[PDB]
Amino acid sequence: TSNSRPYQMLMISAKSKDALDRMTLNLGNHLEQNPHVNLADASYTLQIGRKEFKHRRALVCSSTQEGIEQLNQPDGRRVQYANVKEEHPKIHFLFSGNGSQYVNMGLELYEQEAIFREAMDECFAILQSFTNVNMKEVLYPTTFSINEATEKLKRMEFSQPILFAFEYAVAKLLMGWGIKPEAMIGYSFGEYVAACLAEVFTLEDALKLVVKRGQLMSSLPAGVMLSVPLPEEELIHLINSFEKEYQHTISLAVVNGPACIVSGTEEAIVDFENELKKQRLMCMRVTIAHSHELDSILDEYASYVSTLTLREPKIPYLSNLTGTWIRPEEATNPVYWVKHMRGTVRFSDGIQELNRDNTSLFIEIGPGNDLSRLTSRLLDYENGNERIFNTVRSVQQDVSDMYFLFSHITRMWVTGISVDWEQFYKDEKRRRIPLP
Hints:
This is Phenolphthiocerol/phthiocerol polyketide synthase subunit E. By secondary structure, the protein is α/β, with parallel strands linked by helices.
């Protein structure tokens, strides 16, 4: 209980950069001079009940020696620094869509963080109760080999509710640390998690809904998705001509600003790729849908959604169908959910609405490097990175999950996002100690 987390964030703030840098160097020297100081107590002393000033520096370490090395170089790029100009920034959660999930994603958070673990275990209990499947064995295998869990995570009736649960739990972890969204937006499937957090549906009904969505989609052959670097109005013209010249349908699946994603069967997409080649246009497959291929399951989906309870949102969020704020009467209409399945995802429109306040800050919930890069570019071509913060590493990134999360929380905090340290320390026994 006096034990602490395996990573520690050190927070320092001051009324000028000069004072901040002197304090940073003083703290480094103090830790070098007393190398047995309790690092968790030092971290706690710098956070708990503390006034936060506008020049801020923060870093992550896992040992006193690592903290010393960083503090001795205050302007080193391992360390985060910013001068807060907006003290109460708008915080937006951005929910990742399907496609980047992997076995054991978030494992260190499941192991270490009570808030996260509790949210995940609630989801696993609800899923087991109505599906009779233990989905924890797939996400965090303790009897299956990773090989077998990976194969089972490829089935949509598993991957969709698992991603949903994971993103829900990440969001509850941040909210449980006092990081609350002023507004939200999902990329495609991510809208379902936004809606649950806005209390459009209960966690139980959301989990039933996404299991049903996954089950229905499992009956569909995989099609293909294709990125085309032209704006919406141009894709509309290309698709219209294509459908009249070939005997195939192409759906405009996603609008991402100056580029769009289209989708269809392999046959349709190969013909479309041929037409693009005739027009000497770039394209690239990006298959991971939102298309004509869903039409045969929509009636059944509509019927199911009609059985759930839908309520008006309590946190505002963007609609992927309309590209603007969801209306109360839209969220509560079962037909909205059916249309959302079939319809174009107006992602760039939603991001443009949020970016009307160009000091707003975005936290990506769930894994997805491509989505983070796209969003950054839509916020600001040179400097969008400074306003987006991630939560989960990509499958191939060999980095600790808690390290990755805390690296981004240190960035959030220096940029002006407050953390409820009382909740952060709710399961530890810490003491304030003397510091320079």
